Amino acid sequence: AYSNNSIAIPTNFTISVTTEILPVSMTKTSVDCTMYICGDSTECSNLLLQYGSFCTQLNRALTGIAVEQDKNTQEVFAQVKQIYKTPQIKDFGGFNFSQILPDPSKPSKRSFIEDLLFNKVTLADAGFIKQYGDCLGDIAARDLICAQKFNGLTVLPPLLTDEMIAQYTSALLAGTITSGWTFGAGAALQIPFAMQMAYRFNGIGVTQNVLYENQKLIANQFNSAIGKIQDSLSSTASALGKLQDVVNQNAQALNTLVKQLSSNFGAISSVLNDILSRLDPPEAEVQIDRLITGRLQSLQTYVTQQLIRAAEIRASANLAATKMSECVLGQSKRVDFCGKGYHLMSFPQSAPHGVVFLHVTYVPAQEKNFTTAPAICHDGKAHFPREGVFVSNGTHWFVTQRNFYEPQIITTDNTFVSGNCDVVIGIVNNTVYD
Amino acid sequence: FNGLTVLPPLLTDEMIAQYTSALLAGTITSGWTFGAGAALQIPFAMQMAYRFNGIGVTQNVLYENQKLIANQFNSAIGKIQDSLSSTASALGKLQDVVNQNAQALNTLVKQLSSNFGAISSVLNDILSRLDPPEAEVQIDRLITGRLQSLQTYVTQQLIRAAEIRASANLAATKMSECVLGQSKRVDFCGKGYHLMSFP
Amino acid sequence: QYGSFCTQLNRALTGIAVEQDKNTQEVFAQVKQIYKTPQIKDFGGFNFSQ
Amino acid sequence: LTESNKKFLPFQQFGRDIADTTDAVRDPQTLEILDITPCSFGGVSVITPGTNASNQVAVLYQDVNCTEVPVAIHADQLTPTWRVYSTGSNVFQTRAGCLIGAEHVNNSYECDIPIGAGICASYQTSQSIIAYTMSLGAQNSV
Ligand SMILES: *[C@@H]1O[C@H](CO)[C@@H](O)[C@H](O)[C@H]1NC(C)=O
Ligand SMILES: *[C@@H]1O[C@H](CO)[C@@H](O)[C@H](O)[C@H]1NC(C)=O
Ligand SMILES: *[C@@H]1O[C@H](CO)[C@@H](O)[C@H](O)[C@H]1NC(C)=O
Ligand SMILES: *[C@@H]1O[C@H](CO)[C@@H](O)[C@H](O)[C@H]1NC(C)=O
Ligand SMILES: *[C@@H]1O[C@H](CO)[C@@H](O)[C@H](O)[C@H]1NC(C)=O
Ligand SMILES: *[C@@H]1O[C@H](CO)[C@@H](O)[C@H](O)[C@H]1NC(C)=O
Ligand SMILES: *[C@@H]1O[C@H](CO)[C@@H](O)[C@H](O)[C@H]1NC(C)=O
Ligand SMILES: *[C@@H]1O[C@H](CO)[C@@H](O)[C@H](O)[C@H]1NC(C)=O
Ligand SMILES: *[C@@H]1O[C@H](CO)[C@@H](O)[C@H](O)[C@H]1NC(C)=O
Ligand SMILES: *[C@@H]1O[C@H](CO)[C@@H](O)[C@H](O)[C@H]1NC(C)=O
Ligand SMILES: *[C@@H]1O[C@H](CO)[C@@H](O)[C@H](O)[C@H]1NC(C)=O
């Protein structure tokens, strides 16, 4: 409902907490050059020796990918090298952080929401276990992991354990709740939490008296938002599609690489054993060469897709690092970067091969239309407000701030004089008491 | 006829135009308020005064010189329209993307005539002249070549898709920051002191 | 007799198409409320007809 | 070749694996099922300082507990000066396999050579290879 003399000013507000999930790293893998192609065969290894440095390049690329995965994790989570511990007190002016602060009861010092997130990913760490005792004498055939292990494909463990990542996140949380943004620019400087919230309110353009007068309501809204986030996490399971997608893609790539070993590639048989069993060597070289070419093309395809996926994950990790540095270590004025609305704060939470951000924002709730004028005329002078807008309650004229309806009587401190009343368009007549 | 097809986009151009029209109406009738929540009405001159305060110039400068600024804006829009209607090389990027994709597809089609070391590139006149166990060698050579061509095409497509994804992410950030608000980043929403953007 | 060579190509092309649609949606679907152009054009001398 | 618990069909002779590999074979003379395992163990990493520094190395065996390290790597039919790295004295067990050839210390330093699962190796003073838990940083409080 657009008009040239009508404005709408919000009266209430809502404190909303949103979730953002960003993949940070993927699984690191290694491939045996000889045991995948010519597994346990001196003749085939001798033939493979005539292909030069084909697989050294593959090993180099995979090593670079693993190194960059560790680097991505370090850049995302190691912003601060000082490990602040959670204070013994919880007097944060009515704010309840028990759902995100670490819980010493668990064997891994993780919070409730972190436990939910780590239990929401159905991966079971298939690369782990299988400690060369599981692939031993048993009635059943080999699993999908023993097949990879016996054909030269391995998974390297990450440098940082989940407990160390949890410690980093806990230090970040303690710093951001006990010092504000000061711990990112240097030494951590203590400040009561309500004062920090007032500073953020001033940052978003709302005077801190709004926070001070309505502290209890804001604290209750924050607690309810955290509870709703926890309930949503504990109910649904499709919010973590990205991390599960990365894990599934990597596992599918490895499984396809294993299952490609049964292709004939134009030879008499895909089994290397029953070529040297039936064919004399100089006749067997042709079949062995065809098999070598096919199995060497498979590895190149796998490595190329791995490099592309690594580039995508590196971009995601860079975005996550920027988000941490800007939303968590400070207050961001970029729109739609740290949550929809006016950004207040963010809280980091660790996830399997990823990070989770709890953005806290300020949203106006109920608007009310009013009549507004660009300027107020007086005895040969025009008046404009220093900070705020002019609003009339049908009979009187007041000045009020932008994002919260708080009318004030027009005095000399509110408005400044510039020019005369004829130049300005829409300037209305009203009295300005001193 | 050789198995290569083009899938239509999910969103038609009319739906995209509707989205852009909604964005324009919101940004001209409410300011930046419609991005952070409910759209709140405000007269346009007051919104321009708010932007002037954002760039560090007192709003009385806008109020006193409203007509001149409006005329300058109209003249700038007219000059932009004339420049668009005169030249044609300003849209090199989109035409470049279209040409690259079309050239890739055309090269993939034209690669079907390569012999790849076989007697003939035509599959029909190998099974016509050679008995099957002897024809298997030629068929295998042709299969290997035509399977390598597809892999090269797919790898190039993946790299181009990554580049386009980066460009789309930049476009989304530009929309959110320049259109849904006022940006203080230098040289991000135009050279100078940013006021507004229109998609 | 060449195994799953082309299933991977199909998977990659499908992912590319899906991400193209996702790119368009992320760029253009920021707001889900379709505001219509006002009947008035009294924008204080500014001309948006073009 | 080892003894197998797998059951073959009465007329079967070979057993095939998922990746078209021979798993178990029935002995023609004594009708028993023997499973076939490759004698090449994948997952051996060599931790070394530069060749200009020294020649000492520490070997890491992935996903193996050091009780069955000599069995896994077939240390019986191996040359000397490799059987030293199979059954040693500086045996340390980590979550990323277990490391042989490096002395374990309880002092936490900054990471020098990342091994995995929070364990890093370094070459320090005479000189020897030490392995330790990496340090995230200096403890602090507000
Ligand atoms: C614009 O404001 C003038 C007064 O300055 C008023 O007469 C006119 O009706 C307004 N325009 C509309 C469309 O209401
Ligand atoms: C704002 O909303 C809360 C929650 O409904 C309510 O308790 C409070 O009275 C409202 N404030 C105003 C000024 O309407
Ligand atoms: C914080 O919430 C938990 C459960 O949500 C509750 O047990 C605890 O008492 C709350 N904190 C305070 C100070 O009431
Ligand atoms: C304020 O008034 C305008 C015009 O009279 C109307 O279109 C608009 O809906 C009103 N606002 C509310 C919140 O009712
Ligand atoms: C607008 O608010 C003022 C402030 O109390 C009041 O005196 C005045 O009567 C109100 N106007 C109307 C029309 O209610
Ligand atoms: C305010 O002053 C102007 C000239 O200074 C005059 O035209 C107008 O009528 C006055 N308004 C009222 C309500 O007296
Ligand atoms: C806006 O420009 C068009 C052509 O550029 C013109 O026809 C129209 O009259 C202009 N608007 C006004 C209000 O004059
Ligand atoms: C084969 O002959 C050997 C030697 O006499 C004997 O030990 C073995 O039991 C025989 N196996 C069968 C299946 O007859
Ligand atoms: C190894 O490199 C260092 C580094 O300069 C050098 O001082 C040393 O002489 C080198 N060792 C040999 C044996 O050359
Ligand atoms: C195998 O490794 C585990 C480590 O989880 C260890 O507890 C166990 O004792 C080892 N096996 C033997 C036979 O010692
Ligand atoms: C290091 O800690 C282990 C485990 O407590 C202990 O057995 C060992 O003696 C310690 N080393 C030294 C030098 O004290």
Numbering used by the authors:
A (entry chain B): 698 to 1131
B (entry chain C): 847 to 1045
C (entry chain C): 747 to 796
D (entry chain A): 548 to 672, 681 to 697
Q: What is the paper's account of this structure, in its own sentences?
A:
Cryo-EM data were collected for both BANAL-52 and BANAL-103 S ectodomains, yielding density maps at a resolution of 3.51 Å for BANAL-52 S and 3.11 Å for BANAL-103 S. For BANAL-103 S, the final model includes all residues from 15 to 1131 (excluding residues 72–74, 145–151, 246–252, and 673–680) along with glycans N-linked to 20 sites. Similarly, BANAL-103 S aligns well with the previously reported BANAL-52 closed-conformation S, with an RMSD of 0.88 Å. In contrast, for BANAL-103 S, no LA density was detected in the cryo-EM map. However, it possesses two additional N-glycosylation sites (N112 and N366) located in the NTD and RBD, respectively. These sites, along with N161 and N230, form a more compact trapezoid glycan pocket that restricts the RBD conformational changes. Correlating these findings with their receptor-binding capabilities, we speculate that the extra N-glycosylation sites forming a compact glycan pocket maintain BANAL-103 S in a closed conformation, whereas BANAL-52 S is stabilized in a locked conformation due to the additional binding of LA to the RBD, resulting in even lower S-receptor binding. Compared to BANAL-52 and other SARS-CoV-2-related coronavirus spikes, the BANAL-103 spike contains two extra N-glycans linked to its RBD conformational change, which stabilize the spike in a closed conformation. The results indicated that SARS-CoV-2 and BANAL-103 S-NTD proteins can weakly bind to bovine mucin, while BANAL-52 exhibited no apparent binding. These findings suggest that BANAL-103 S, with glycan binding capacity, would be more easily activated compared to BANAL-52 S, consistent with the biochemical assay results.
